[PDB]
Amino acid sequence: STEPLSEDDFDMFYEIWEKFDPEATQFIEYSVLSDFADALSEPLRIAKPNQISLINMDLPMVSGDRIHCMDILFAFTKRVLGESGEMDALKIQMEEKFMAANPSKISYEPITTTLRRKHEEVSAMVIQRAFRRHLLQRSLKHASFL
Amino acid sequence: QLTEEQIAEFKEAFSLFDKDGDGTITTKELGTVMRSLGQNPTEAELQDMINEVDADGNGTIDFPEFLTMMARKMKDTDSEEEIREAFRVFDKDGNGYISAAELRHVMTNLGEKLTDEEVDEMIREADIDGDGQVNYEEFVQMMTA
Ligand SMILES: [Mg+2]
Ligand SMILES: [Mg+2]
Ligand SMILES: [Mg+2]
Ligand SMILES: [Mg+2]
């Protein structure tokens, strides 16, 4: 398996990255991954109504809800190419090239994934729901001293 | 009773997984569609859901078949089994204790966010022992009587 290697599109990635990550921090925030995935060219682009597509790529995240270009890359190319046991070669390969060929040792300590962050967000709401309920039950308690 | 602008979102999730375009998702996806939507579905809850809508063994859930399902989940008030799981998601080390700091973090930054002053009262209540470390199972039992 060897799919559309649109190889002036791997480049089109970088331009649009630079639009979002000017300092070349290697990181963009979550609250922007939608806009980013969109404003690319048509193969790698993930058009709007975008959110749930993102959480499903299982993108790792690091402190401060940042995400790394090299995770975003493979994630987005995995989409345009189709999943396969042969991709597992692709990942560990596109990252060994990137690593030897990079003098920038950077902070890479992954916290969540875009998946967890979703289950995390609703579990918060469960706890947030019960405690708003309880708070009120409590306020009516205090109301009814008798 | 009725759902909301979250129909916008259920549509999004459903639409993504329907690669064919027949407006019906293959039932083994159902479990995947929902994990992508934030919910926790057991292979049991799946089965009961699956054969309580698809009683005709076709493997079909069209979008109405689906929107009514969620309407039945949202509908109910969360359990205590569920407030338990939800807390356990945030006790990453796995010891039954969560810090009044990590709590306050999660609580003030995820979901229907709690204001600084609500969380204050949450901690006053959950941390009886002043050590800023709360046994959440102990806290569940506090908001259940
Ligand atoms: Mg279909
Ligand atoms: Mg059906
Ligand atoms: Mg703990
Ligand atoms: Mg304590």
Coordinates of C-alpha atoms and ligand atoms in Angstrom, one line a residue:
Chain A
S1 CA 0.0 0.0 0.0
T2 CA 1.4 3.4 -1.2
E3 CA -1.3 6.1 -1.4
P4 CA -1.5 9.7 -2.8
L5 CA 2.0 10.9 -1.8
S6 CA 0.9 14.5 -2.7
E7 CA 4.5 15.6 -2.0
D8 CA 4.0 19.3 -2.5
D9 CA 1.2 18.9 0.1
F10 CA 3.6 17.7 2.8
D11 CA 5.0 21.1 2.1
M12 CA 1.6 22.8 2.1
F13 CA 1.4 21.6 5.6
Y14 CA 4.3 23.6 6.7
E15 CA 3.1 26.9 5.3
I16 CA -0.2 26.7 7.2
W17 CA 1.6 25.5 10.3
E18 CA 3.8 28.6 10.2
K19 CA 0.7 30.7 10.0
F20 CA -0.4 29.1 13.4
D21 CA 3.0 28.4 15.0
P22 CA 5.1 31.4 14.0
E23 CA 7.8 30.9 16.7
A24 CA 8.2 27.4 15.5
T25 CA 7.5 26.0 18.9
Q26 CA 6.5 22.7 17.4
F27 CA 3.2 23.1 19.2
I28 CA -0.3 24.4 18.5
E29 CA -3.1 24.7 21.1
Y30 CA -6.3 22.5 21.0
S31 CA -8.5 25.6 20.8
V32 CA -7.4 26.1 17.2
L33 CA -6.8 22.6 15.9
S34 CA -10.2 23.0 14.2
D35 CA -9.3 26.1 12.3
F36 CA -5.9 24.6 11.4
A37 CA -7.2 21.3 10.1
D38 CA -9.5 23.3 7.9
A39 CA -7.4 26.0 6.2
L40 CA -5.2 23.3 4.5
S41 CA -5.4 22.0 1.0
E42 CA -8.1 19.5 0.0
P43 CA -6.4 16.1 0.7
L44 CA -5.2 16.7 4.3
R45 CA -7.8 19.3 5.0
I46 CA -10.6 18.4 7.4
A47 CA -13.4 20.8 6.6
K48 CA -15.6 22.5 9.2
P49 CA -18.0 20.6 11.3
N50 CA -14.7 19.3 12.5
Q51 CA -14.7 18.7 16.3
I52 CA -15.6 15.0 16.5
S53 CA -13.3 14.1 13.6
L54 CA -10.5 15.5 15.7
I55 CA -11.3 13.8 19.0
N56 CA -11.3 10.5 17.1
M57 CA -7.8 10.8 15.8
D58 CA -6.7 10.2 19.4
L59 CA -4.2 13.1 19.2
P60 CA -1.9 13.2 22.3
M61 CA -1.8 16.4 24.2
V62 CA 0.8 17.9 26.5
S63 CA 0.7 20.4 29.4
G64 CA -1.4 23.5 28.6
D65 CA -3.5 21.8 25.9
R66 CA -0.9 21.9 23.2
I67 CA -0.4 19.4 20.4
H68 CA 2.7 18.5 18.3
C69 CA 3.0 19.0 14.6
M70 CA 4.5 15.5 14.2
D71 CA 1.5 13.9 15.9
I72 CA -0.9 16.1 13.9
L73 CA 1.0 15.2 10.7
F74 CA 0.8 11.4 10.9
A75 CA -2.7 11.6 12.3
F76 CA -3.9 13.7 9.4
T77 CA -2.0 11.5 6.8
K78 CA -3.4 8.3 8.4
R79 CA -6.8 9.7 7.5
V80 CA -6.2 10.5 3.8
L81 CA -4.5 7.1 3.4
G82 CA -6.6 4.6 5.3
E83 CA -5.9 2.7 8.4
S84 CA -3.8 -0.6 8.1
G85 CA -1.4 -2.8 10.1
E86 CA 1.2 -1.4 7.7
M87 CA 0.7 2.1 9.0
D88 CA 2.4 1.1 12.3
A89 CA 5.6 1.0 10.3
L90 CA 4.8 4.5 8.9
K91 CA 4.5 6.1 12.3
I92 CA 7.7 4.8 14.0
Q93 CA 9.4 5.7 10.7
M94 CA 8.2 9.2 10.1
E95 CA 9.3 10.0 13.7
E96 CA 12.8 8.4 13.5
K97 CA 13.4 10.5 10.4
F98 CA 12.1 13.6 12.2
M99 CA 14.2 12.9 15.3
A100 CA 17.7 12.1 14.0
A101 CA 17.0 15.0 11.6
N102 CA 16.2 17.5 14.3
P103 CA 18.6 19.3 16.7
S104 CA 15.7 20.5 18.8
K105 CA 15.3 18.4 21.9
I106 CA 11.9 19.5 23.0
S107 CA 9.6 19.0 26.0
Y108 CA 7.4 16.0 25.0
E109 CA 5.5 14.7 28.1
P110 CA 2.0 13.6 26.9
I111 CA -0.9 14.1 29.3
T112 CA -4.2 13.3 27.6
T113 CA -5.5 12.4 24.2
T114 CA -8.3 14.2 22.4
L115 CA -10.4 11.1 23.2
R116 CA -9.9 11.1 27.0
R117 CA -10.3 14.9 27.0
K118 CA -13.8 14.2 25.7
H119 CA -14.7 11.5 28.3
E120 CA -12.9 13.8 30.8
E121 CA -15.1 16.7 29.7
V122 CA -18.4 14.8 30.3
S123 CA -17.3 13.1 33.5
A124 CA -16.7 16.6 34.8
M125 CA -20.3 17.4 33.9
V126 CA -21.6 14.4 35.8
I127 CA -19.7 15.6 38.9
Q128 CA -20.7 19.2 38.1
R129 CA -24.3 18.2 37.8
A130 CA -24.5 16.3 41.1
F131 CA -22.8 19.1 43.0
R132 CA -25.0 21.9 41.6
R133 CA -28.0 19.7 42.6
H134 CA -26.5 19.1 46.0
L135 CA -25.7 22.7 46.5
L136 CA -29.3 23.7 45.9
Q137 CA -30.8 20.9 48.0
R138 CA -28.5 22.2 50.7
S139 CA -29.7 25.8 50.2
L140 CA -33.3 24.7 50.5
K141 CA -32.3 22.8 53.6
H142 CA -30.8 26.0 55.2
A143 CA -34.0 27.8 54.0
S144 CA -36.1 25.4 55.9
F145 CA -34.7 25.5 59.4
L146 CA -37.5 24.0 61.4
Chain B
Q1 CA -37.7 16.0 27.6
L2 CA -36.5 17.5 24.3
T3 CA -32.7 17.8 23.4
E4 CA -31.0 21.0 22.4
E5 CA -28.2 22.5 20.2
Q6 CA -26.4 19.2 21.1
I7 CA -28.4 17.8 18.2
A8 CA -25.9 19.7 16.1
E9 CA -23.3 17.6 17.7
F10 CA -25.0 14.2 17.6
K11 CA -25.5 14.9 13.9
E12 CA -21.8 15.6 13.5
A13 CA -20.8 12.3 15.2
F14 CA -23.3 10.3 13.2
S15 CA -22.4 11.9 9.9
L16 CA -18.7 11.2 10.4
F17 CA -19.2 7.4 10.8
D18 CA -21.6 7.0 8.0
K19 CA -19.1 6.6 5.1
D20 CA -21.7 5.2 2.7
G21 CA -24.3 7.9 3.1
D22 CA -27.4 5.9 3.6
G23 CA -28.2 7.7 6.9
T24 CA -27.9 4.6 8.9
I25 CA -24.7 3.4 10.8
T26 CA -23.6 -0.2 11.0
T27 CA -24.4 -1.3 14.6
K28 CA -20.8 -2.3 15.6
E29 CA -19.9 1.4 15.0
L30 CA -22.6 2.4 17.5
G31 CA -20.1 1.6 20.3
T32 CA -17.5 3.7 18.5
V33 CA -19.8 6.6 17.6
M34 CA -20.5 7.1 21.3
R35 CA -16.9 6.8 22.7
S36 CA -16.2 9.6 20.2
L37 CA -19.1 11.5 21.8
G38 CA -17.7 11.3 25.3
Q39 CA -20.0 8.6 26.7
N40 CA -19.0 5.4 28.5
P41 CA -20.8 2.4 26.9
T42 CA -20.4 -1.2 28.2
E43 CA -20.7 -4.1 25.8
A44 CA -23.8 -4.9 27.9
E45 CA -25.4 -1.4 27.7
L46 CA -24.6 -1.8 24.0
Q47 CA -26.4 -5.1 23.6
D48 CA -29.5 -3.9 25.4
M49 CA -29.5 -0.7 23.4
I50 CA -28.8 -2.6 20.2
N51 CA -31.6 -5.2 20.4
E52 CA -34.1 -2.7 21.9
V53 CA -34.0 -0.5 18.7
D54 CA -32.9 -3.1 16.1
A55 CA -35.4 -5.8 17.0
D56 CA -35.5 -6.7 13.3
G57 CA -31.8 -8.0 13.2
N58 CA -30.8 -5.7 10.3
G59 CA -28.0 -4.0 12.2
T60 CA -29.6 -0.6 11.5
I61 CA -29.7 2.6 13.4
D62 CA -30.9 5.6 11.3
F63 CA -30.4 9.0 12.8
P64 CA -33.9 9.3 14.4
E65 CA -33.4 5.7 15.8
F66 CA -30.2 7.3 17.4
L67 CA -31.5 10.7 18.5
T68 CA -34.2 8.9 20.5
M69 CA -31.6 6.7 22.2
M70 CA -29.6 9.7 23.5
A71 CA -32.9 11.3 24.5
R72 CA -33.5 8.3 26.8
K73 CA -30.0 8.6 28.3
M74 CA -29.9 12.4 28.9
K75 CA -33.4 11.9 30.2
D76 CA -32.4 10.1 33.4
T77 CA -30.7 11.7 36.4
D78 CA -27.1 10.3 36.8
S79 CA -26.6 7.4 39.2
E80 CA -24.1 7.1 42.0
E81 CA -22.4 4.3 40.1
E82 CA -21.8 7.0 37.5
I83 CA -20.7 9.8 39.8
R84 CA -18.2 7.2 41.1
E85 CA -16.8 6.3 37.6
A86 CA -16.6 10.0 36.8
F87 CA -14.5 10.8 39.8
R88 CA -12.3 7.7 39.1
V89 CA -11.4 9.2 35.7
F90 CA -9.6 12.0 37.7
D91 CA -7.8 9.8 40.2
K92 CA -5.1 8.9 37.7
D93 CA -2.8 7.3 40.3
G94 CA -5.6 5.0 41.4
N95 CA -5.7 5.4 45.2
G96 CA -9.2 6.9 45.8
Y97 CA -7.9 10.3 46.6
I98 CA -7.9 13.5 44.4
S99 CA -6.2 16.7 45.4
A100 CA -8.3 19.8 46.1
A101 CA -6.0 21.4 43.5
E102 CA -6.5 19.0 40.7
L103 CA -10.2 19.0 41.6
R104 CA -10.4 22.7 41.4
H105 CA -8.5 22.6 38.1
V106 CA -10.8 20.0 36.4
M107 CA -13.8 21.7 37.9
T108 CA -13.0 25.2 36.8
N109 CA -11.8 24.3 33.4
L110 CA -13.8 21.4 32.0
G111 CA -17.5 20.9 31.3
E112 CA -20.2 23.2 32.7
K113 CA -17.4 25.0 34.6
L114 CA -17.8 25.8 38.2
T115 CA -17.2 29.4 39.3
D116 CA -14.3 30.0 41.7
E117 CA -16.8 30.4 44.5
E118 CA -18.7 27.2 43.9
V119 CA -15.6 25.1 43.9
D120 CA -14.6 26.9 47.2
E121 CA -17.7 25.4 48.8
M122 CA -17.0 22.1 47.0
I123 CA -13.7 21.8 48.8
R124 CA -14.9 23.0 52.2
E125 CA -17.3 20.1 51.9
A126 CA -15.1 17.4 50.4
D127 CA -12.0 18.2 52.4
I128 CA -13.1 17.8 56.0
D129 CA -9.5 17.1 57.2
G130 CA -7.8 20.3 55.9
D131 CA -5.1 18.3 54.1
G132 CA -6.2 19.3 50.6
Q133 CA -6.5 15.7 49.4
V134 CA -10.1 14.3 49.2
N135 CA -11.4 10.8 49.3
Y136 CA -14.0 11.1 46.5
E137 CA -15.9 8.0 47.5
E138 CA -16.3 9.7 50.8
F139 CA -17.6 12.7 48.8
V140 CA -20.1 10.7 46.7
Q141 CA -21.7 9.4 49.9
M142 CA -22.0 13.0 51.1
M143 CA -24.2 14.0 48.1
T144 CA -26.5 11.1 48.4
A145 CA -28.5 11.7 51.7
Ligands
MG1 MG -24.4 3.7 6.6
MG2 MG -32.7 -0.4 13.1
MG3 MG -5.3 9.9 43.6
MG4 MG -8.6 16.1 52.6

